[PDB]
């Protein structure tokens, strides 16, 4: 294994967080929240003189896809779980259903809160986001998520077609074996870059699902196979360089009439329903800053390639990946 590749693999080992099926602690935190939901629904619906609805849970997010990273010091883990209630979407307002869930989790941890696409519970060190779905069998065979906040108007409270397991399947199935391993490593690298360089203004940070969808569209394996021995070596630095360049190539200067100027915009459609641009909520100014930081990262990947000393190559990378990127002592 080549030197800078060795450094990338060590970096990966430091940032990776084990997926649900390999992480008893995550499974326990998830299951504690789900048990609390069940008990709280018993109580909430007894107070209404009704039988509580049942739900089936399923894993979502980066810990379901084996792309999870550890948070930086002072950050929180983001546990994502979907719950499918045995209800018909046409019988209930979606924010009302989320209110059931929020009330059920009234006293669990540091309280609960209804967000646009989920109900969030808080615990020291992590939060659990519960995406709330209606039963497809009772709702016309489509899986719909409860969108809307308590303050949302009628047009913002909707049951939106969704496909989280299809997205998970697309990410799992794009590649296989060690190719898929490099794909997941590069997603993790960019998530740590995101956490390190978008910490001043978290609301301007690109969503992790947006980085993952971008990788789905544009990541390419970088490896070499020795023609005589068939030994295979991977080159994560080169894979990242090509991927970041392809992302940059897909920015488009977009005129904004209100501001009478252009902003660079990257559109990244989800590859499953509802096929939306994952970055659509980023402002033009946030996109300009995103592009500038991606460019600086690209320049660093290229500079790292041409350094004589491993120390200097790793320093150039740590300037963008943060202090857990290993930097060997200068001679």
PDB file of C-alpha atoms in Angstrom:
ATOM      1  CA  UNK A   1       0.000   0.000   0.000  1.00  0.00           C
ATOM      2  CA  UNK A   2       1.283   3.424  -1.036  1.00  0.00           C
ATOM      3  CA  UNK A   3       2.059   6.119   1.610  1.00  0.00           C
ATOM      4  CA  UNK A   4      -0.717   8.702   1.147  1.00  0.00           C
ATOM      5  CA  UNK A   5      -3.210   5.862   0.653  1.00  0.00           C
ATOM      6  CA  UNK A   6      -2.053   4.500   4.004  1.00  0.00           C
ATOM      7  CA  UNK A   7      -2.768   7.900   5.529  1.00  0.00           C
ATOM      8  CA  UNK A   8      -6.250   8.032   3.987  1.00  0.00           C
ATOM      9  CA  UNK A   9      -7.075   4.544   5.284  1.00  0.00           C
ATOM     10  CA  UNK A  10      -5.929   5.557   8.796  1.00  0.00           C
ATOM     11  CA  UNK A  11      -8.064   8.717   8.550  1.00  0.00           C
ATOM     12  CA  UNK A  12     -11.018   6.545   7.521  1.00  0.00           C
ATOM     13  CA  UNK A  13     -10.463   4.266  10.514  1.00  0.00           C
ATOM     14  CA  UNK A  14     -10.524   7.324  12.785  1.00  0.00           C
ATOM     15  CA  UNK A  15     -13.710   8.907  11.405  1.00  0.00           C
ATOM     16  CA  UNK A  16     -15.889   5.880  10.680  1.00  0.00           C
ATOM     17  CA  UNK A  17     -18.851   5.046  12.890  1.00  0.00           C
ATOM     18  CA  UNK A  18     -20.149   1.475  12.771  1.00  0.00           C
ATOM     19  CA  UNK A  19     -23.541   0.938  11.122  1.00  0.00           C
ATOM     20  CA  UNK A  20     -26.611  -0.245  13.057  1.00  0.00           C
ATOM     21  CA  UNK A  21     -25.997  -3.949  12.398  1.00  0.00           C
ATOM     22  CA  UNK A  22     -22.472  -3.619  13.867  1.00  0.00           C
ATOM     23  CA  UNK A  23     -23.134  -1.072  16.651  1.00  0.00           C
ATOM     24  CA  UNK A  24     -24.871  -2.294  19.808  1.00  0.00           C
ATOM     25  CA  UNK A  25     -24.789   1.199  21.336  1.00  0.00           C
ATOM     26  CA  UNK A  26     -26.638   2.794  18.412  1.00  0.00           C
ATOM     27  CA  UNK A  27     -29.162  -0.064  18.379  1.00  0.00           C
ATOM     28  CA  UNK A  28     -29.801   0.457  22.094  1.00  0.00           C
ATOM     29  CA  UNK A  29     -30.297   4.230  21.802  1.00  0.00           C
ATOM     30  CA  UNK A  30     -32.643   3.731  18.845  1.00  0.00           C
ATOM     31  CA  UNK A  31     -34.582   1.014  20.676  1.00  0.00           C
ATOM     32  CA  UNK A  32     -34.945   3.101  23.831  1.00  0.00           C
ATOM     33  CA  UNK A  33     -36.561   5.867  21.787  1.00  0.00           C
ATOM     34  CA  UNK A  34     -38.851   3.385  20.024  1.00  0.00           C
ATOM     35  CA  UNK A  35     -39.953   1.816  23.318  1.00  0.00           C
ATOM     36  CA  UNK A  36     -40.663   5.306  24.659  1.00  0.00           C
ATOM     37  CA  UNK A  37     -42.766   6.025  21.562  1.00  0.00           C
ATOM     38  CA  UNK A  38     -44.837   2.885  22.148  1.00  0.00           C
ATOM     39  CA  UNK A  39     -45.476   3.650  25.829  1.00  0.00           C
ATOM     40  CA  UNK A  40     -46.219   7.307  25.149  1.00  0.00           C
ATOM     41  CA  UNK A  41     -48.714   6.397  22.429  1.00  0.00           C
ATOM     42  CA  UNK A  42     -50.477   4.097  24.888  1.00  0.00           C
ATOM     43  CA  UNK A  43     -50.815   7.066  27.245  1.00  0.00           C
ATOM     44  CA  UNK A  44     -51.684   9.680  24.598  1.00  0.00           C
ATOM     45  CA  UNK A  45     -54.466   7.600  23.112  1.00  0.00           C
ATOM     46  CA  UNK A  46     -55.815   6.402  26.452  1.00  0.00           C
ATOM     47  CA  UNK A  47     -56.238  10.092  27.302  1.00  0.00           C
ATOM     48  CA  UNK A  48     -58.322  10.393  24.116  1.00  0.00           C
ATOM     49  CA  UNK A  49     -60.320   7.261  24.944  1.00  0.00           C
ATOM     50  CA  UNK A  50     -58.958   5.447  21.878  1.00  0.00           C
ATOM     51  CA  UNK A  51     -56.752   2.463  21.150  1.00  0.00           C
ATOM     52  CA  UNK A  52     -53.210   3.474  20.288  1.00  0.00           C
ATOM     53  CA  UNK A  53     -52.048   2.923  16.702  1.00  0.00           C
ATOM     54  CA  UNK A  54     -49.192   0.507  16.126  1.00  0.00           C
ATOM     55  CA  UNK A  55     -46.107   1.145  14.021  1.00  0.00           C
ATOM     56  CA  UNK A  56     -43.300  -0.756  12.379  1.00  0.00           C
ATOM     57  CA  UNK A  57     -39.819   0.817  12.580  1.00  0.00           C
ATOM     58  CA  UNK A  58     -37.000   0.637  10.065  1.00  0.00           C
ATOM     59  CA  UNK A  59     -33.468   2.019   9.972  1.00  0.00           C
ATOM     60  CA  UNK A  60     -32.743   5.196   7.981  1.00  0.00           C
ATOM     61  CA  UNK A  61     -29.880   7.493   7.223  1.00  0.00           C
ATOM     62  CA  UNK A  62     -26.130   7.128   7.250  1.00  0.00           C
ATOM     63  CA  UNK A  63     -26.052   4.430   9.937  1.00  0.00           C
ATOM     64  CA  UNK A  64     -28.369   2.314   7.777  1.00  0.00           C
ATOM     65  CA  UNK A  65     -26.171   2.838   4.720  1.00  0.00           C
ATOM     66  CA  UNK A  66     -22.803   2.210   6.407  1.00  0.00           C
ATOM     67  CA  UNK A  67     -21.666   5.766   5.631  1.00  0.00           C
ATOM     68  CA  UNK A  68     -21.735   7.064   9.194  1.00  0.00           C
ATOM     69  CA  UNK A  69     -19.038   9.275  10.684  1.00  0.00           C
ATOM     70  CA  UNK A  70     -18.208  10.210  14.241  1.00  0.00           C
ATOM     71  CA  UNK A  71     -19.051  13.817  15.130  1.00  0.00           C
ATOM     72  CA  UNK A  72     -16.361  16.318  15.911  1.00  0.00           C
ATOM     73  CA  UNK A  73     -15.821  17.150  19.586  1.00  0.00           C
ATOM     74  CA  UNK A  74     -18.936  18.925  20.785  1.00  0.00           C
ATOM     75  CA  UNK A  75     -21.093  17.533  17.988  1.00  0.00           C
ATOM     76  CA  UNK A  76     -24.025  15.153  18.243  1.00  0.00           C
ATOM     77  CA  UNK A  77     -24.776  11.793  16.668  1.00  0.00           C
ATOM     78  CA  UNK A  78     -27.759  11.830  14.283  1.00  0.00           C
ATOM     79  CA  UNK A  79     -29.805   8.634  14.696  1.00  0.00           C
ATOM     80  CA  UNK A  80     -32.426   8.279  11.926  1.00  0.00           C
ATOM     81  CA  UNK A  81     -35.362   5.879  12.110  1.00  0.00           C
ATOM     82  CA  UNK A  82     -38.563   5.612  10.107  1.00  0.00           C
ATOM     83  CA  UNK A  83     -41.799   4.476  11.701  1.00  0.00           C
ATOM     84  CA  UNK A  84     -44.794   3.351   9.648  1.00  0.00           C
ATOM     85  CA  UNK A  85     -48.054   3.828  11.553  1.00  0.00           C
ATOM     86  CA  UNK A  86     -51.004   1.562  10.748  1.00  0.00           C
ATOM     87  CA  UNK A  87     -53.123   4.487   9.536  1.00  0.00           C
ATOM     88  CA  UNK A  88     -54.528   5.766   6.248  1.00  0.00           C
ATOM     89  CA  UNK A  89     -52.952   9.063   5.199  1.00  0.00           C
ATOM     90  CA  UNK A  90     -56.293  10.364   3.921  1.00  0.00           C
ATOM     91  CA  UNK A  91     -57.742  10.026   7.436  1.00  0.00           C
ATOM     92  CA  UNK A  92     -55.278  12.269   9.256  1.00  0.00           C
ATOM     93  CA  UNK A  93     -53.523  15.578   9.042  1.00  0.00           C
ATOM     94  CA  UNK A  94     -49.776  14.791   8.872  1.00  0.00           C
ATOM     95  CA  UNK A  95     -48.797  17.340  11.481  1.00  0.00           C
ATOM     96  CA  UNK A  96     -51.509  15.892  13.738  1.00  0.00           C
ATOM     97  CA  UNK A  97     -49.860  12.457  13.458  1.00  0.00           C
ATOM     98  CA  UNK A  98     -46.478  13.980  14.236  1.00  0.00           C
ATOM     99  CA  UNK A  99     -48.153  15.641  17.234  1.00  0.00           C
ATOM    100  CA  UNK A 100     -49.111  12.165  18.443  1.00  0.00           C
ATOM    101  CA  UNK A 101     -45.461  11.167  18.258  1.00  0.00           C
ATOM    102  CA  UNK A 102     -44.203  14.399  19.877  1.00  0.00           C
ATOM    103  CA  UNK A 103     -46.662  14.101  22.761  1.00  0.00           C
ATOM    104  CA  UNK A 104     -45.741  10.444  23.225  1.00  0.00           C
ATOM    105  CA  UNK A 105     -42.105  11.520  23.715  1.00  0.00           C
ATOM    106  CA  UNK A 106     -43.018  14.421  26.013  1.00  0.00           C
ATOM    107  CA  UNK A 107     -40.758  13.551  28.946  1.00  0.00           C
ATOM    108  CA  UNK A 108     -38.206  11.300  27.241  1.00  0.00           C
ATOM    109  CA  UNK A 109     -34.741  12.819  27.383  1.00  0.00           C
ATOM    110  CA  UNK A 110     -34.528  16.567  26.815  1.00  0.00           C
ATOM    111  CA  UNK A 111     -37.981  16.723  25.179  1.00  0.00           C
ATOM    112  CA  UNK A 112     -39.282  16.365  21.630  1.00  0.00           C
ATOM    113  CA  UNK A 113     -39.903  18.747  18.757  1.00  0.00           C
ATOM    114  CA  UNK A 114     -41.794  18.666  15.446  1.00  0.00           C
ATOM    115  CA  UNK A 115     -39.596  19.500  12.447  1.00  0.00           C
ATOM    116  CA  UNK A 116     -40.571  19.798   8.788  1.00  0.00           C
ATOM    117  CA  UNK A 117     -39.775  16.169   7.922  1.00  0.00           C
ATOM    118  CA  UNK A 118     -39.519  14.429  11.293  1.00  0.00           C
ATOM    119  CA  UNK A 119     -40.006  14.470  15.038  1.00  0.00           C
ATOM    120  CA  UNK A 120     -36.710  14.983  16.885  1.00  0.00           C
ATOM    121  CA  UNK A 121     -35.875  13.780  20.411  1.00  0.00           C
ATOM    122  CA  UNK A 122     -32.802  15.063  22.262  1.00  0.00           C
ATOM    123  CA  UNK A 123     -30.412  13.166  24.543  1.00  0.00           C
ATOM    124  CA  UNK A 124     -26.986  14.095  25.923  1.00  0.00           C
ATOM    125  CA  UNK A 125     -24.712  13.594  22.935  1.00  0.00           C
ATOM    126  CA  UNK A 126     -27.223  12.618  20.263  1.00  0.00           C
ATOM    127  CA  UNK A 127     -30.619  13.211  18.750  1.00  0.00           C
ATOM    128  CA  UNK A 128     -33.064  10.732  17.239  1.00  0.00           C
ATOM    129  CA  UNK A 129     -35.004  11.862  14.164  1.00  0.00           C
ATOM    130  CA  UNK A 130     -38.186   9.835  13.631  1.00  0.00           C
ATOM    131  CA  UNK A 131     -39.578  10.087  10.121  1.00  0.00           C
ATOM    132  CA  UNK A 132     -43.318   9.414  10.343  1.00  0.00           C
ATOM    133  CA  UNK A 133     -45.086   7.505   7.563  1.00  0.00           C
ATOM    134  CA  UNK A 134     -48.603   6.323   6.838  1.00  0.00           C
ATOM    135  CA  UNK A 135     -49.267   2.657   6.077  1.00  0.00           C
ATOM    136  CA  UNK A 136     -48.945   2.085   2.296  1.00  0.00           C
ATOM    137  CA  UNK A 137     -51.568  -0.673   2.381  1.00  0.00           C
ATOM    138  CA  UNK A 138     -54.072   1.823   3.822  1.00  0.00           C
ATOM    139  CA  UNK A 139     -52.861   4.815   1.759  1.00  0.00           C
ATOM    140  CA  UNK A 140     -53.005   3.564  -1.830  1.00  0.00           C
ATOM    141  CA  UNK A 141     -49.815   1.492  -1.921  1.00  0.00           C
ATOM    142  CA  UNK A 142     -47.413   4.448  -1.727  1.00  0.00           C
ATOM    143  CA  UNK A 143     -45.180   5.222   1.237  1.00  0.00           C
ATOM    144  CA  UNK A 144     -45.778   8.820   2.346  1.00  0.00           C
ATOM    145  CA  UNK A 145     -43.948  10.898   4.936  1.00  0.00           C
ATOM    146  CA  UNK A 146     -45.635  13.481   7.168  1.00  0.00           C
ATOM    147  CA  UNK A 147     -44.365  16.912   6.109  1.00  0.00           C
ATOM    148  CA  UNK A 148     -45.174  20.171   7.891  1.00  0.00           C
ATOM    149  CA  UNK A 149     -44.603  22.036  11.140  1.00  0.00           C
ATOM    150  CA  UNK A 150     -47.102  23.242  13.709  1.00  0.00           C
ATOM    151  CA  UNK A 151     -46.785  26.768  12.272  1.00  0.00           C
ATOM    152  CA  UNK A 152     -47.016  25.530   8.666  1.00  0.00           C
ATOM    153  CA  UNK A 153     -49.888  26.672   6.480  1.00  0.00           C
ATOM    154  CA  UNK A 154     -52.278  24.313   4.709  1.00  0.00           C
ATOM    155  CA  UNK A 155     -50.128  24.171   1.561  1.00  0.00           C
ATOM    156  CA  UNK A 156     -47.094  23.064   3.621  1.00  0.00           C
ATOM    157  CA  UNK A 157     -48.799  20.230   5.538  1.00  0.00           C
ATOM    158  CA  UNK A 158     -48.735  17.252   3.214  1.00  0.00           C
ATOM    159  CA  UNK A 159     -48.206  13.521   2.878  1.00  0.00           C
ATOM    160  CA  UNK A 160     -45.287  13.351   0.454  1.00  0.00           C
ATOM    161  CA  UNK A 161     -44.329  10.241  -1.504  1.00  0.00           C
ATOM    162  CA  UNK A 162     -41.001   8.961  -0.221  1.00  0.00           C
ATOM    163  CA  UNK A 163     -38.648   6.048  -0.794  1.00  0.00           C
ATOM    164  CA  UNK A 164     -35.997   5.828   1.943  1.00  0.00           C
ATOM    165  CA  UNK A 165     -35.350   2.103   1.523  1.00  0.00           C
ATOM    166  CA  UNK A 166     -35.065   2.546  -2.247  1.00  0.00           C
ATOM    167  CA  UNK A 167     -32.447   5.229  -1.681  1.00  0.00           C
ATOM    168  CA  UNK A 168     -30.622   2.958   0.778  1.00  0.00           C
ATOM    169  CA  UNK A 169     -30.739   0.175  -1.839  1.00  0.00           C
ATOM    170  CA  UNK A 170     -29.346   2.478  -4.546  1.00  0.00           C
ATOM    171  CA  UNK A 171     -26.415   3.452  -2.323  1.00  0.00           C
ATOM    172  CA  UNK A 172     -25.749  -0.204  -1.324  1.00  0.00           C
ATOM    173  CA  UNK A 173     -26.019  -1.562  -4.871  1.00  0.00           C
ATOM    174  CA  UNK A 174     -24.100   0.991  -6.986  1.00  0.00           C
ATOM    175  CA  UNK A 175     -20.812  -0.904  -6.576  1.00  0.00           C
ATOM    176  CA  UNK A 176     -19.710  -4.072  -4.751  1.00  0.00           C
ATOM    177  CA  UNK A 177     -16.787  -5.376  -2.700  1.00  0.00           C
ATOM    178  CA  UNK A 178     -13.708  -3.180  -2.389  1.00  0.00           C
ATOM    179  CA  UNK A 179     -15.071  -0.777  -5.044  1.00  0.00           C
ATOM    180  CA  UNK A 180     -18.093  -0.137  -2.822  1.00  0.00           C
ATOM    181  CA  UNK A 181     -15.730   0.177   0.137  1.00  0.00           C
ATOM    182  CA  UNK A 182     -13.845   3.030  -1.559  1.00  0.00           C
ATOM    183  CA  UNK A 183     -17.187   4.666  -2.445  1.00  0.00           C
ATOM    184  CA  UNK A 184     -18.221   4.618   1.227  1.00  0.00           C
ATOM    185  CA  UNK A 185     -14.789   5.855   2.379  1.00  0.00           C
ATOM    186  CA  UNK A 186     -15.041   8.860   0.066  1.00  0.00           C
ATOM    187  CA  UNK A 187     -18.538   9.703   1.285  1.00  0.00           C
ATOM    188  CA  UNK A 188     -17.169   9.639   4.841  1.00  0.00           C
ATOM    189  CA  UNK A 189     -14.179  11.821   3.898  1.00  0.00           C
ATOM    190  CA  UNK A 190     -16.471  14.463   2.480  1.00  0.00           C
ATOM    191  CA  UNK A 191     -18.737  14.312   5.529  1.00  0.00           C
ATOM    192  CA  UNK A 192     -15.790  15.046   7.807  1.00  0.00           C
ATOM    193  CA  UNK A 193     -14.673  17.818   5.459  1.00  0.00           C
ATOM    194  CA  UNK A 194     -18.216  19.194   5.715  1.00  0.00           C
ATOM    195  CA  UNK A 195     -18.179  19.079   9.512  1.00  0.00           C
ATOM    196  CA  UNK A 196     -14.725  20.690   9.719  1.00  0.00           C
ATOM    197  CA  UNK A 197     -15.139  23.500   7.186  1.00  0.00           C
ATOM    198  CA  UNK A 198     -18.838  24.370   7.560  1.00  0.00           C
ATOM    199  CA  UNK A 199     -18.866  24.771  11.353  1.00  0.00           C
ATOM    200  CA  UNK A 200     -19.168  28.579  11.519  1.00  0.00           C
ATOM    201  CA  UNK A 201     -22.585  28.495   9.859  1.00  0.00           C
ATOM    202  CA  UNK A 202     -24.235  25.081  10.118  1.00  0.00           C
ATOM    203  CA  UNK A 203     -27.290  26.266   8.207  1.00  0.00           C
ATOM    204  CA  UNK A 204     -25.053  26.892   5.167  1.00  0.00           C
ATOM    205  CA  UNK A 205     -23.604  23.358   5.286  1.00  0.00           C
ATOM    206  CA  UNK A 206     -24.414  20.871   2.507  1.00  0.00           C
ATOM    207  CA  UNK A 207     -26.650  18.073   3.726  1.00  0.00           C
ATOM    208  CA  UNK A 208     -25.014  14.694   4.158  1.00  0.00           C
ATOM    209  CA  UNK A 209     -27.714  13.133   2.001  1.00  0.00           C
ATOM    210  CA  UNK A 210     -26.787  15.643  -0.679  1.00  0.00           C
ATOM    211  CA  UNK A 211     -23.146  14.584  -0.598  1.00  0.00           C
ATOM    212  CA  UNK A 212     -24.269  10.957  -0.709  1.00  0.00           C
ATOM    213  CA  UNK A 213     -26.567  11.530  -3.692  1.00  0.00           C
ATOM    214  CA  UNK A 214     -23.788  13.436  -5.445  1.00  0.00           C
ATOM    215  CA  UNK A 215     -21.523  10.431  -4.910  1.00  0.00           C
ATOM    216  CA  UNK A 216     -24.240   8.133  -6.285  1.00  0.00           C
ATOM    217  CA  UNK A 217     -24.328  10.169  -9.511  1.00  0.00           C
ATOM    218  CA  UNK A 218     -20.655  11.014  -9.952  1.00  0.00           C
ATOM    219  CA  UNK A 219     -18.247   8.897  -7.880  1.00  0.00           C
ATOM    220  CA  UNK A 220     -15.812   6.765  -9.885  1.00  0.00           C
ATOM    221  CA  UNK A 221     -13.496   4.114  -8.452  1.00  0.00           C
ATOM    222  CA  UNK A 222      -9.757   4.817  -8.672  1.00  0.00           C
ATOM    223  CA  UNK A 223      -7.648   1.669  -8.566  1.00  0.00           C
ATOM    224  CA  UNK A 224      -4.831  -0.016 -10.434  1.00  0.00           C
ATOM    225  CA  UNK A 225      -4.441  -3.727 -11.192  1.00  0.00           C
ATOM    226  CA  UNK A 226      -0.906  -4.996 -11.779  1.00  0.00           C
ATOM    227  CA  UNK A 227      -1.057  -6.755 -15.187  1.00  0.00           C
ATOM    228  CA  UNK A 228       1.285  -9.587 -14.137  1.00  0.00           C
ATOM    229  CA  UNK A 229       0.313 -10.271 -10.501  1.00  0.00           C
ATOM    230  CA  UNK A 230      -3.281  -8.932 -10.717  1.00  0.00           C
ATOM    231  CA  UNK A 231      -2.613  -7.210  -7.376  1.00  0.00           C
ATOM    232  CA  UNK A 232      -5.059  -4.330  -6.869  1.00  0.00           C
ATOM    233  CA  UNK A 233      -4.255  -1.027  -5.185  1.00  0.00           C
ATOM    234  CA  UNK A 234      -6.769   1.741  -4.485  1.00  0.00           C
ATOM    235  CA  UNK A 235      -6.059   5.497  -4.690  1.00  0.00           C
ATOM    236  CA  UNK A 236      -8.518   7.372  -2.479  1.00  0.00           C
ATOM    237  CA  UNK A 237      -6.808  10.721  -3.108  1.00  0.00           C
ATOM    238  CA  UNK A 238      -7.274  10.349  -6.870  1.00  0.00           C
ATOM    239  CA  UNK A 239     -10.863   9.094  -6.439  1.00  0.00           C
ATOM    240  CA  UNK A 240     -11.659  12.183  -4.348  1.00  0.00           C
ATOM    241  CA  UNK A 241      -9.933  14.473  -6.855  1.00  0.00           C
ATOM    242  CA  UNK A 242     -11.990  13.151  -9.763  1.00  0.00           C
ATOM    243  CA  UNK A 243     -15.239  13.221  -7.737  1.00  0.00           C
ATOM    244  CA  UNK A 244     -14.735  16.774  -6.455  1.00  0.00           C
ATOM    245  CA  UNK A 245     -13.817  17.978  -9.952  1.00  0.00           C
ATOM    246  CA  UNK A 246     -16.988  16.365 -11.376  1.00  0.00           C
ATOM    247  CA  UNK A 247     -19.116  18.050  -8.719  1.00  0.00           C
ATOM    248  CA  UNK A 248     -17.484  21.386  -9.517  1.00  0.00           C
ATOM    249  CA  UNK A 249     -18.129  20.793 -13.226  1.00  0.00           C
ATOM    250  CA  UNK A 250     -21.831  20.434 -12.484  1.00  0.00           C
ATOM    251  CA  UNK A 251     -22.216  23.898 -10.929  1.00  0.00           C
ATOM    252  CA  UNK A 252     -24.107  26.283 -13.229  1.00  0.00           C
ATOM    253  CA  UNK A 253     -24.079  30.078 -12.949  1.00  0.00           C
ATOM    254  CA  UNK A 254     -27.724  30.958 -12.279  1.00  0.00           C
ATOM    255  CA  UNK A 255     -29.132  34.458 -12.641  1.00  0.00           C
ATOM    256  CA  UNK A 256     -31.115  35.753  -9.684  1.00  0.00           C
ATOM    257  CA  UNK A 257     -33.454  38.558 -10.734  1.00  0.00           C
ATOM    258  CA  UNK A 258     -34.107  39.880  -7.225  1.00  0.00           C
ATOM    259  CA  UNK A 259     -30.377  40.379  -6.575  1.00  0.00           C
ATOM    260  CA  UNK A 260     -29.560  41.234 -10.218  1.00  0.00           C
ATOM    261  CA  UNK A 261     -26.554  38.925 -10.227  1.00  0.00           C
ATOM    262  CA  UNK A 262     -25.618  35.292 -10.740  1.00  0.00           C
ATOM    263  CA  UNK A 263     -24.824  32.611  -8.177  1.00  0.00           C
ATOM    264  CA  UNK A 264     -23.246  29.212  -8.908  1.00  0.00           C
ATOM    265  CA  UNK A 265     -25.753  26.446  -8.235  1.00  0.00           C
ATOM    266  CA  UNK A 266     -25.325  22.687  -7.981  1.00  0.00           C
ATOM    267  CA  UNK A 267     -28.511  20.666  -8.491  1.00  0.00           C
ATOM    268  CA  UNK A 268     -28.427  17.103  -7.106  1.00  0.00           C
ATOM    269  CA  UNK A 269     -31.646  15.177  -7.656  1.00  0.00           C
ATOM    270  CA  UNK A 270     -32.498  12.330  -5.368  1.00  0.00           C
ATOM    271  CA  UNK A 271     -32.425   9.160  -7.539  1.00  0.00           C
ATOM    272  CA  UNK A 272     -35.710   7.920  -5.997  1.00  0.00           C
ATOM    273  CA  UNK A 273     -39.067   9.499  -5.170  1.00  0.00           C
ATOM    274  CA  UNK A 274     -39.713  12.356  -4.767  1.00  0.00           C
ATOM    275  CA  UNK A 275     -36.699  13.079  -7.078  1.00  0.00           C
ATOM    276  CA  UNK A 276     -36.170  16.536  -5.577  1.00  0.00           C
ATOM    277  CA  UNK A 277     -33.032  18.669  -5.729  1.00  0.00           C
ATOM    278  CA  UNK A 278     -31.482  17.889  -2.333  1.00  0.00           C
ATOM    279  CA  UNK A 279     -29.675  21.264  -2.369  1.00  0.00           C
ATOM    280  CA  UNK A 280     -32.724  23.339  -3.387  1.00  0.00           C
ATOM    281  CA  UNK A 281     -32.907  25.101   0.014  1.00  0.00           C
ATOM    282  CA  UNK A 282     -29.318  26.415  -0.105  1.00  0.00           C
ATOM    283  CA  UNK A 283     -29.166  30.106  -0.981  1.00  0.00           C
ATOM    284  CA  UNK A 284     -27.052  31.431  -3.819  1.00  0.00           C
ATOM    285  CA  UNK A 285     -24.587  32.907  -1.329  1.00  0.00           C
ATOM    286  CA  UNK A 286     -24.333  29.538   0.463  1.00  0.00           C
ATOM    287  CA  UNK A 287     -23.725  27.827  -2.875  1.00  0.00           C
ATOM    288  CA  UNK A 288     -21.007  30.306  -3.763  1.00  0.00           C
ATOM    289  CA  UNK A 289     -19.260  29.513  -0.494  1.00  0.00           C
ATOM    290  CA  UNK A 290     -19.806  25.758  -1.021  1.00  0.00           C
ATOM    291  CA  UNK A 291     -18.220  25.985  -4.469  1.00  0.00           C
ATOM    292  CA  UNK A 292     -15.270  28.031  -3.206  1.00  0.00           C
ATOM    293  CA  UNK A 293     -14.537  25.516  -0.453  1.00  0.00           C
ATOM    294  CA  UNK A 294     -14.888  22.582  -2.859  1.00  0.00           C
ATOM    295  CA  UNK A 295     -12.400  24.307  -5.144  1.00  0.00           C
ATOM    296  CA  UNK A 296      -9.967  24.819  -2.278  1.00  0.00           C
ATOM    297  CA  UNK A 297     -10.317  21.120  -1.406  1.00  0.00           C
ATOM    298  CA  UNK A 298      -9.652  20.143  -5.043  1.00  0.00           C
ATOM    299  CA  UNK A 299      -6.553  22.346  -5.142  1.00  0.00           C
ATOM    300  CA  UNK A 300      -5.338  20.700  -1.927  1.00  0.00           C
ATOM    301  CA  UNK A 301      -5.852  17.179  -3.318  1.00  0.00           C
ATOM    302  CA  UNK A 302      -3.766  18.163  -6.350  1.00  0.00           C
ATOM    303  CA  UNK A 303      -1.078  19.841  -4.236  1.00  0.00           C
ATOM    304  CA  UNK A 304      -0.867  16.750  -2.028  1.00  0.00           C
ATOM    305  CA  UNK A 305      -0.155  14.640  -5.114  1.00  0.00           C
ATOM    306  CA  UNK A 306       2.962  16.706  -5.966  1.00  0.00           C
ATOM    307  CA  UNK A 307       4.607  17.076  -2.527  1.00  0.00           C
ATOM    308  CA  UNK A 308       8.042  15.473  -2.175  1.00  0.00           C
ATOM    309  CA  UNK A 309       7.633  14.904   1.581  1.00  0.00           C
ATOM    310  CA  UNK A 310       4.761  12.874   3.030  1.00  0.00           C
ATOM    311  CA  UNK A 311       4.559  15.414   5.869  1.00  0.00           C
ATOM    312  CA  UNK A 312       3.732  18.265   3.462  1.00  0.00           C
ATOM    313  CA  UNK A 313       1.240  16.165   1.482  1.00  0.00           C
ATOM    314  CA  UNK A 314      -0.604  15.221   4.670  1.00  0.00           C
ATOM    315  CA  UNK A 315      -0.504  18.773   6.031  1.00  0.00           C
ATOM    316  CA  UNK A 316      -2.147  20.010   2.821  1.00  0.00           C
ATOM    317  CA  UNK A 317      -4.902  17.418   3.301  1.00  0.00           C
ATOM    318  CA  UNK A 318      -5.357  18.087   7.041  1.00  0.00           C
ATOM    319  CA  UNK A 319      -5.991  21.749   6.228  1.00  0.00           C
ATOM    320  CA  UNK A 320      -9.316  20.555   4.769  1.00  0.00           C
ATOM    321  CA  UNK A 321     -10.076  17.296   6.603  1.00  0.00           C
ATOM    322  CA  UNK A 322      -9.158  18.552  10.088  1.00  0.00           C
ATOM    323  CA  UNK A 323      -6.919  17.455  12.921  1.00  0.00           C
ATOM    324  CA  UNK A 324      -7.649  13.725  12.726  1.00  0.00           C
ATOM    325  CA  UNK A 325      -6.068  13.499   9.310  1.00  0.00           C
ATOM    326  CA  UNK A 326      -2.703  11.878  10.181  1.00  0.00           C
ATOM    327  CA  UNK A 327       0.345  14.063   9.565  1.00  0.00           C
ATOM    328  CA  UNK A 328       3.744  12.346   9.952  1.00  0.00           C
ATOM    329  CA  UNK A 329       6.616  14.131  11.650  1.00  0.00           C
ATOM    330  CA  UNK A 330       8.727  16.315   9.393  1.00  0.00           C
ATOM    331  CA  UNK A 331      12.259  14.916   9.035  1.00  0.00           C
TER     332      UNK A 331
END
